[PDB]
């Protein structure tokens, strides 16, 4: 048999498999907005 190195370590690296991943944005589960009908004290629907 061949005396293979135990490849317990990454030096290639997997960075081709890594930066291909586009990373989710899940900071706030309702998508980063406070959902409120009271804090719209203002409205652009008025003129103009």
């Amino acid at each position: 048999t061949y005396p293979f190195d135990q490849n317990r370590f990454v030096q290639y690296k997997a960075t081709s498999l890594e930066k291909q991943h586009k990373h989710d944005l899940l900071t706030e589960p309702d998508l980063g907005v406070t959902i409120d009908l009271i804090n719209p004290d203002t409205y652009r629907i008025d003129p103009n």
């Binding site: 706030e28 409120d36 009271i38």
Partner: protein, 129 residues
């Protein structure tokens, strides 16, 4: 705005609280309630505190406005349900900006209990649901 009006019992529409300074909200409860002032002003200065950049004294001074639903108001219980739906929404909102020390339930309990009294008078508000 930066100073709206707080009506008196006798010779009303005379006194003002300028909101550029920050008074403590508990003495505001006093100076409102020795004057038997209408519940609408409690919402108005709550909005003043919120536009002053406050989310916590804003939401706790209104807890003192939960006592005076119809105190001398001649059926401003519509005004009390408007008061209480603000706490029923902003307790659960301030629970989402929770800190390292309290629990989410440390505000969700107060949100859920006060919502029960919010549904005692009025059902299926645009904010109840």
């Amino acid at each position: 705005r930066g100073s709206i009006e707080i009506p008196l019992r006798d010779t009303d529409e005379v006194i003002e609280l300028d909101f550029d300074q920050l008074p403590e909200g508990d003495e505001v409860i006093s100076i409102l309630k020795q004057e038997h002032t209408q519940l609408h002003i409690w919402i108005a200065l709550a909005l003043e505190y919120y536009k002053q950049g406050k989310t916590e004294e804003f939401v706790k001074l209104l807890e003192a406005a939960r006592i005076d639903g119809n105190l001398d108001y001649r059926d401003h219980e519509k005004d009390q349900m408007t008061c209480l739906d603000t706490l029923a929404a902003y307790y659960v909102q301030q629970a989402r900006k929770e800190k390292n020390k309290d629990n989410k339930k440390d505000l969700i309990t107060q949100a859920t209990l006060l919502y029960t009294m919010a549904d005692k008078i009025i059902m299926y508000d645009q904010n109840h649901l």
